[PDB]
Design an enzyme around this catalytic site. Structure first.
Site, mmCIF file in Angstrom:
data_model
loop_
_atom_site.group_PDB
_atom_site.id
_atom_site.type_symbol
_atom_site.label_atom_id
_atom_site.label_comp_id
_atom_site.label_asym_id
_atom_site.label_seq_id
_atom_site.Cartn_x
_atom_site.Cartn_y
_atom_site.Cartn_z
ATOM 1 N N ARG B 35 0.784 -1.184 -0.120
ATOM 2 C CA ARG B 35 0.078 -0.032 -0.087
ATOM 3 C C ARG B 35 0.921 1.352 -0.091
ATOM 4 N NH1 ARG B 35 -4.799 0.056 2.136
ATOM 5 N NH2 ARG B 35 -4.984 2.205 2.190
ATOM 6 N N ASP B 147 13.716 2.108 11.694
ATOM 7 C CA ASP B 147 13.100 0.821 11.381
ATOM 8 C C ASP B 147 14.005 -0.446 10.840
ATOM 9 O OD1 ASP B 147 11.201 -1.167 10.711
ATOM 10 O OD2 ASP B 147 10.149 0.122 9.213
HETATM 11 N N1 LIG Z 1 18.906 -7.820 -2.461
HETATM 12 C C1 LIG Z 1 18.368 -7.059 -2.318
HETATM 13 N N2 LIG Z 1 16.914 -6.931 -1.804
HETATM 14 C C2 LIG Z 1 16.179 -5.761 -1.679
HETATM 15 C C3 LIG Z 1 16.831 -4.822 -1.650
HETATM 16 N N3 LIG Z 1 15.792 -3.615 -1.274
HETATM 17 C C4 LIG Z 1 14.680 -4.416 -0.883
HETATM 18 N N4 LIG Z 1 14.965 -5.948 -1.049
HETATM 19 C C5 LIG Z 1 14.039 -6.706 -0.663
HETATM 20 O O1 LIG Z 1 12.762 -6.315 -1.046
HETATM 21 C C6 LIG Z 1 11.838 -6.194 -0.310
HETATM 22 C C7 LIG Z 1 10.962 -4.991 -0.487
HETATM 23 O O2 LIG Z 1 11.791 -3.690 -0.429
HETATM 24 P P1 LIG Z 1 11.587 -2.881 0.753
HETATM 25 O O3 LIG Z 1 10.053 -2.246 0.477
HETATM 26 O O4 LIG Z 1 12.524 -2.010 1.036
HETATM 27 O O5 LIG Z 1 11.093 -3.959 2.092
HETATM 28 P P2 LIG Z 1 11.660 -3.450 3.587
HETATM 29 O O6 LIG Z 1 12.938 -2.929 3.601
HETATM 30 O O7 LIG Z 1 11.302 -4.618 4.575
HETATM 31 O O8 LIG Z 1 10.403 -2.359 3.828
HETATM 32 P P3 LIG Z 1 10.876 -0.686 4.276
HETATM 33 O O9 LIG Z 1 11.426 -0.952 5.502
HETATM 34 O O10 LIG Z 1 9.528 0.234 4.022
HETATM 35 O O11 LIG Z 1 12.062 -0.164 3.279
HETATM 36 C C8 LIG Z 1 12.454 -6.374 1.065
HETATM 37 O O12 LIG Z 1 12.082 -6.978 2.187
HETATM 38 C C9 LIG Z 1 13.893 -7.019 0.827
HETATM 39 O O13 LIG Z 1 13.426 -8.461 0.842
HETATM 40 C C10 LIG Z 1 18.009 -4.500 -2.260
HETATM 41 O O14 LIG Z 1 18.437 -3.204 -2.092
HETATM 42 N N5 LIG Z 1 18.769 -5.704 -2.436
#
Ligand SMILES: Nc1nc2c(ncn2[C@@H]2O[C@H](COP(=O)(O)OP(=O)(O)OP(=O)(O)O)[C@@H](O)[C@H]2O)c(=O)[nH]1
Ligand SMILES: *C(=O)CCCCCCCCCCCCC
Lengths: 49, 339, 394
Positions: B35, B147
């Site tokens: 979302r 976070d």
């Molecule tokens: N290998 C790799 N995986 C990533 C990267 N960024 C995000 N991911 C993966 O993709 C998912 C979705 O991205 P995010 O929105 O950043 O997920 P998140 O870090 O748990 O959420 P936020 O705390 O809001 O940033 C994450 O849970 C990770 O598993 C990255 O830069 N490299």
């Protein structure tokens, strides 16, 4: 000569994980083709499967 | 506003369509959509990039106040080696979308826990040491993450930990009884894992300044304390949202999750970093001083930390140069690493 | 025909992923040719579908004429019924025999021009009676400007759950009414004739009073015919369990409809998979008036209803695999609530089945959930503000 988004270049960024590729070939060995008709999982592995 | 409005037009149209507008990026893989943020990997002249796209389905929302804080947070962490801030924030990437761009890193710590080769005991300590060094380098720089979770603690292919996705936008304090803030902002991995410091959950009687009051340094020490417990358990979370609020009220304790940790010295560290009372949590730097030799080998502070920093530097030691440098230094390295 | 033609009419796919859009175009060219290569009786279907298309196109043109805002609802209704009986230029009154899109077995001869009227809502859903070949009138609702794809999916999945429970002989008397998107902004829904519970309590004051007015009998525990209350008990259990698993969000009594035979059903699905505009919504559609119809928690109906709920739940867990696989294929289907969080959508549905709980523990979980959800009266309070908002829109 310059960068502004990718601060920490990684040379293995999109390369194949050769260590994982090595574990595929060993753990999932096809040569067991003739043995696996006889050999089957035992009590402790039946439950697990 | 996206929480109250919930209107469909931008969200149905989201992710790949955004990249059709921007020039320097090509969509490559949706890493996750929620979302809140539509996160996709993109190819770029410099390498792989992660773009978090936010759909501005409310034109009255003063994103410029978040944009300012993003540029300021970037300038501070501009020299923290273990901290990767969002490098760009474009308000006008599309008619109704805002985009946050940062480096894509080889693995997130949650994946790395399970991808091969499995992190040796010494490597888990080297990552834990860098987690503390990442929060430390942020704290001394004057920035708090807010976070810290294994999904945001990245790891390059050479074990260089990069703390990422600094949560300046996510609310500082969350209502205890209303998960609608946690779910939208914090649970982006949907694992239900809650590493939010318990003093951040407050009664509705405490409540908009509560949403954006400054993060306290001790709020990150708690998060990092849980990331290390998860890492050393190999993915077993320390607290879920039901267990954390019960922990906050003193009705729960991760005894079964902590006993799972093999290294008695790390279980001691984690038990301190996750202590409920925020005043009983030391600065990250105090855990580094305390654990020197006690849990993090002396080699980490004297040689590994300053040596590895050579490669985290932006000046590109290409794959050929890194090898040639280690070969040059090999005698010095064996000396510093084998007595 | 309709499913694939929706994609061909999907101007969003035409721009965001033209390769997929052209694939459907070639699927339709293939189907167009595969019918022409069929038997004589099959080739006729190709011409029948071409007829359906131009029939629906003419119907859309009539509604586009109404949409011109050339006057008040009076002039709109006048133009509507005048155009329908225009046997020269539209002849929708007595068009050539065509199988109806919404239900092809119910072949139609045309729209009865006297019966078409739009409901009092901003979507202008047009009530339509179809002159069937059998001489009967078939009731349908035609909608304009509403992307029925979300309802279409959420109904075609409850129809499966109804069907699956019927395989277990647990006929909970759901009403899997049919819906069919003819286009991204046009379609039909089966007009199950019924009164909304919001109007029931405004007219008879209570569900039990309504049943006493249309199905009274001294044999039942509360003066309601045993066959009607037993239908209501099972119908309530079916929609409670199925809206909980599908996470249906809204709870407005203006959209919970009650049939005289006691089949309760829900018709608003614009908010599903856990999201509701009202913060902290109850876990399920178990409003207190639904329980008042059963005479409260002390009645025999409530004891039976609880048994039907845990049984209907326990038997859907038996088919969780099937239900989930039907969402994974839908992850990219442009449904508004799926397009918000596509990769999480299946994880949300899988959460509801509590597959980690053993069967006795799954009963206790569902039991705890229903025993608690009765007291979440916050939605019954906040819904009074929504009615106030509607008062300014009428
Ligand atoms: N290998 C790799 N995986 C990533 C990267 N960024 C995000 N991911 C993966 O993709 C998912 C979705 O991205 P995010 O929105 O950043 O997920 P998140 O870090 O748990 O959420 P936020 O705390 O809001 O940033 C994450 O849970 C990770 O598993 C990255 O830069 N490299
Ligand atoms: C209300 O429901 C929505 C509140 C959204 C707050 C988060 C905004 C995130 C902005 C990121 C920075 C963008 C800079 C252009």
């Amino acid at each position: 000569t310059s960068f502004e988004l990718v601060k920490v270049p990684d040379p293995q960024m999109s390369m194949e994980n050769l260590v994982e590729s090595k574990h595929h070939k060993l753990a999932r060995s096809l040569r067991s083709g003739p043995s696996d008709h006889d050999l089957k999982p035992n009590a402790a592995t039946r439950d697990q499967l | 506003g996206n929480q109250l409005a919930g209107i469909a037009p931008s969200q149905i149209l989201s992710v790949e369509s955004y990249f059709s507008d921007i020039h320097d990026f090509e969509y490559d893989k949706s890493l996750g959509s929620t979302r809140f943020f539509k996160v996709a990997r993109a190819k770029h002249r410099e390498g792989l990039v992660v773009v978090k796209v936010f759909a501005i389905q409310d034109p009255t929302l003063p994103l410029t106040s978040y944009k300012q804080e993003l540029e300021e947070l970037k300038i501070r962490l501009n020299s923290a080696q273990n901290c990767l801030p969002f490098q760009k924030a474009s308000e006008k990437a599309s008619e109704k979308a805002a985009m946050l761009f940062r480096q894509y890193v080889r693995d997130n710590l949650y994946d790395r826990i399970s991808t091969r080769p499995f992190l040796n005991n010494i490597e888990k300590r080297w990552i834990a040491f860098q987690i503390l060094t990442a929060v430390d380098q942020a704290h001394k720089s004057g920035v708090r993450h807010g976070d810290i979770k294994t999904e945001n603690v990245m790891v390059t292919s050479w074990n260089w930990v990069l703390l990422t996705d600094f949560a300046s936008f996510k609310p500082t304090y969350l209502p205890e009884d209303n998960p609608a803030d946690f779910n939208y902002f914090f649970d982006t991995s949907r694992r239900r894992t809650c590493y939010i410091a318990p003093e951040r959950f407050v009664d509705g009687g405490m409540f908009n300044q509560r949403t954006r009051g400054e993060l306290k340094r001790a709020m990150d020490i708690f998060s990092a304390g849980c990331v290390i417990a998860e890492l050393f358990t190999e993915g077993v979370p320390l607290f879920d949202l039901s267990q954390l609020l019960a922990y906050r009220n003193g009705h729960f304790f991760p005894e079964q999750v902590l006993n799972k940790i093999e290294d008695h010295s790390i279980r001691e560290l984690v038990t301190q970093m996750i202590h409920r009372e925020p005043d009983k949590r030391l600065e990250a730097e105090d855990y580094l001083k305390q654990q020197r030799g006690n849990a993090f080998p002396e080699i980490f502070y004297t040689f590994l930390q300053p040596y590895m920093a050579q490669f985290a530097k932006e000046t590109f030691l290409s794959a050929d140069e890194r090898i040639l440098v280690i070969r040059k230094d090999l005698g010095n390295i064996i000396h510093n690493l084998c007595g | 025909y309709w499913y694939v033609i929706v994609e061909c009419e999907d101007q969003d796919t035409q721009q965001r992923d033209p390769k997929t859009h052209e694939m459907y175009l070639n699927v339709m060219r293939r189907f167009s040719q595969a019918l022409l290569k069929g038997d004589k009786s099959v080739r006729v279907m190709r011409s029948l579908l071409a007829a359906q298309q131009t029939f629906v196109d003419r119907l859309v043109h009539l509604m586009k004429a109404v949409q011109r805002e050339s006057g008040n609802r009076k002039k709109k209704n006048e133009r509507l019924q005048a155009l329908l009986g225009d046997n020269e230029k539209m002849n929708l009154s007595d068009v050539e025999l065509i199988p109806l899109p919404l239900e092809p077995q119910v072949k139609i001869r045309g729209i009865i021009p006297e019966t078409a009227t739009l409901f009092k809502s901003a979507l202008m859903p047009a009530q339509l009676f179809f002159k069937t070949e059998d001489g009967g009138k078939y009731p349908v609702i035609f909608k304009h400007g509403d992307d029925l794809r979300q309802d279409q999916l959420i109904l075609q999945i409850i129809s499966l759950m109804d069907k699956l429970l019927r395989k277990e002989n647990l006929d909970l008397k759901l009403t899997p009414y049919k819906v069919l998107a003819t286009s991204t902004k046009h379609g039909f829904m089966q007009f199950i004739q019924s009164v909304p519970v919001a109007e029931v309590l405004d007219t008879e004051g209570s569900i039990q009073n309504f049943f006493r007015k249309y199905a009274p009998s001294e044999n039942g525990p509360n003066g309601i015919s045993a066959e009607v209350m037993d239908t209501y008990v099972k119908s309530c259990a079916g929609y409670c369990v199925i809206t909980y698993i599908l996470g249906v969000g809204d709870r407005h009594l203006d959209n919970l409809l009650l049939t005289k035979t006691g089949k309760l059903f829900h018709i608003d699905f614009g908010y599903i998979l856990g999201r509701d505009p009202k913060p902290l919504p109850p876990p399920m559609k178990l409003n207190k008036e639904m329980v008042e119809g059963m005479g409260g928690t002390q009645s025999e109906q409530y004891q039976e209803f609880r048994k039907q709920c845990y049984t209907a739940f326990l038997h859907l867990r038996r088919y969780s695999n099937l239900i989930l696989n039907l969402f994974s294929l839908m992850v990219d289907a442009n449904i508004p609530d799926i397009a918000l969080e596509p990769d999480k959508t299946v994880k949300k549905v899988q959460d509801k089945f509590r597959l980690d709980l053993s069967d006795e523990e799954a009963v206790h979980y569902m039991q705890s959930l229903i025993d608690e959800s009765v007291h979440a009266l916050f939605a019954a309070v906040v819904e009074q503000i929504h009615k106030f908002a509607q008062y300014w829109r009428k």
